[PDB]
Amino acid sequence: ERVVYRPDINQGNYLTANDVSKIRVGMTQQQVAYALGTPLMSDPFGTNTWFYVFRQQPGHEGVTQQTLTLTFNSSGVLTNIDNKPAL
C-alpha cells in the first residue's frame, strides 16, 4: 500500500469517554441509555451487548476503530463497559 490519501473509511456511533463514565457496571440498559441511547448494533445472539463501534482509515495510514460495546446482563443491568480500540 503506497497510498498516502484516498477517500477514507469512516463510521460514527461509538461511546464517548463521557458515555463510558456516564454508566457503570450495574447500571440498567435504560439507565445506560439515558444519555447514551441505544447503539446501532446490539447482540441478537447472546445478552444485551450494546456495540457502539467506530471504524476509520485515513488514506492507507493505519486503520482506526473504537469498539465501545456495553455487555449488560439479560436484566439489562450493565456487566461490562467493553471499549475495544483500533485493531
Binding site: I9, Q11, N13, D43, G46, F51, R55, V63, Q65
Partner: protein
C-alpha cells in the same frame, strides 16, 4: 364508454369483450355500465371483470384500482381473495420489471416498493383468505419475495462490507437475520456480521455469528 344505455346492454357489451379478449371494449362497457349503474347487480363481478379486463389488458394499477374498487365498493363475491391475489399480482410485476433481461442482469436486489406490497397481499391472501385457490400462488409468491426483500437488503450489507462501515454491515445482516427465517441471502448476510465484527475486533461476538453458520449449515 357507451352512452346512457340500459345496464345489461352495457353489461353484455362488457361481457362479450371479456370473452372476446377485447378488454378495453370490456372497460368501455364495464364502466359505462358503472357510469349510470354502478349499483348494477353484477358490479361486484364487473369490478372483478374489470380486473379480468384490466390485468388481462395488463392494466395492473387500474386492476389494482378495480381490485380495491372491488373490496371497497362492491366486495360481495368470494373473489376478495382473488382480489388479494390480484392485488399482489399487480404488485409483484409492478416492482421488478425491465428490458434488461435479454442481457442478463438482476431485478431482485433492487428496491422492493410494490414487491413489499405483493409481499403483503400474497401474505394477506395466505393469512386473511387462507382457504383460497389464490393462496397457492401466494405462498410461492412470498418465498422469492422475502428473498427479494433479502437480496435487496443483502446488497446494503454487501455494500457496507465494501465501505468499511462495519457496524453498517451487521446493521443490515442482523436486521435481515431478524427478518428472514429461510432466505439464502440472510444466510449469506450471516457471515458478513461475523466478518464485520472481526474488523471491529468483536471476534468473540463474531463467533456468536459463526455458530449460526454452524446452524445455518442446517
Amino acid at each position: 364508454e357507451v352512452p346512457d344505455n340500459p345496464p345489461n346492454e352495457i353489461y353484455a357489451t362488457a361481457q362479450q369483450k371479456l370473452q372476446d379478449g377485447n378488454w378495453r371494449q370490456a372497460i368501455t362497457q364495464l364502466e359505462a355500465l358503472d357510469n349510470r349503474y354502478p349499483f348494477g347487480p353484477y358490479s361486484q363481478q364487473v369490478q372483478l371483470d374489470l380486473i379480468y379486463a384490466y390485468y388481462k389488458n395488463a392494466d395492473l394499477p387500474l386492476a389494482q384500482a378495480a381490485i380495491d374498487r372491488f373490496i371497497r365498493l362492491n366486495p360481495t363475491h368470494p373473489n376478495i381473495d382473488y382480489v388479494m391475489y390480484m392485488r399482489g399480482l399487480t404488485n409483484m410485476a409492478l416492482d421488478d420489471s425491465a428490458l434488461q433481461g435479454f442481457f442478463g442482469v438482476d431485478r431482485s436486489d433492487r428496491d422492493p416498493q410494490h414487491a413489499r406490497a405483493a409481499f403483503s397481499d400474497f401474505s394477506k391472501l395466505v393469512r386473511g383468505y387462507p382457504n383460497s385457490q389464490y393462496t397457492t400462488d401466494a405462498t410461492k409468491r412470498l418465498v422469492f419475495l422475502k428473498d427479494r426483500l433479502a437480496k435487496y437488503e443483502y446488497s446494503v450489507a454487501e455494500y457496507y462490507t465494501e465501505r468499511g462501515a462495519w457496524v453498517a454491515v451487521v446493521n443490515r445482516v442482523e436486521g435481515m437475520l431478524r427478518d428472514y427465517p429461510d432466505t439464502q441471502a440472510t444466510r449469506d448476510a450471516l457471515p458478513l456480521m461475523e466478518n464485520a465484527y472481526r474488523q471491529m475486533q468483536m471476534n468473540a461476538q463474531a463467533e456468536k455469528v459463526a455458530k449460526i453458520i454452524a446452524a445455518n449449515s442446517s
